Amino acid sequence: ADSCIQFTRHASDVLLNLNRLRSRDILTDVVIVVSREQFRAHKTVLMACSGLFYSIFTDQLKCNLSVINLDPEINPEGFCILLDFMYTSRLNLREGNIMAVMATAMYLQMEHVVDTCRKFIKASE
Amino acid sequence: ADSCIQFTRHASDVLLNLNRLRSRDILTDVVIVVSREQFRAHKTVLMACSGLFYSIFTDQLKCNLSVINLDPEINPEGFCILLDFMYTSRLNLREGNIMAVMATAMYLQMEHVVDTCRKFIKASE
C-alpha cells in the first residue's frame, strides 16, 4: 504494498516501446491474415486488447499457431486501424472507414471502440 | 493520421491485462534466474522496460534463450520489485529495500527508477 509510488508515464512508455518492437518486427510471433493482407503482431498484445484474440490464444491448440486467418467478411483496412489502436491508443476513425472499423471491433470484441463508433454514427443521423 | 481520437485508459488497461497474463503464466516465454529464485515473464515486456533486456533479446543468439541468468550480486527481492514495477507502474520502495532496488535498476538500465531512488536517499541525508 500500500506504500507504492507510481510512474504516471510508464504504461504509455511501455506501449510506445511495444509498438517500436512491432515496427521493427522484433519478437513478433503471429501473422494475422485478413483475406489478401498479412499483419505481424505479438500474441500478448492482441490478447490484452481483444476478447476474440484472448479466446484464441488461451485455446490449448490455437495458442501454438503462428498464422491466424480471420473471417473473409473482415475488412483489412478496418483491421489495420484496430491493430494500430491496440499498439498506440489512437483510433483513426473517419466517415469513409467507420462502418468497417465498427464491424471489425464487434468481431474482435473491443467494446470501447464499438461504443465510440455508435456515438459518432448516432451524431450524424 | 492527424485526425485520430485517443482512449485515455488504453495503455494502463493493456498493462493490467499483460500483468494478468503473467499472474496466470499465460504465454510467458522466459525464466529470469536471480541466484536461487526464478521469475517467469514475457520477453517483449522486459525489452519495453529495461535497456539490459532490450540488449539481451535483440542479440541474434540470446533472443532464443528460454532461461537468462542474472549476475549473482543482484538481489532477488530487488528484482521482484522491479519486475512488478514493469508490469504495473507501481514501485514498492521502502527504507529496507531502496539500496537493492537502486542497484538492480542501475543494472537493468531503468533510469527513472534510479532517479527516484537517488532522490529518496538524498532526502534522508
Binding site: 509510488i5 507510481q6 | 527513472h112
Partner: peptide
C-alpha cells in the same frame, strides 16, 4: 513523474 497512486 512519480506520484502517490
Amino acid at each position: 513523474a512519480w506520484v502517490i497512486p
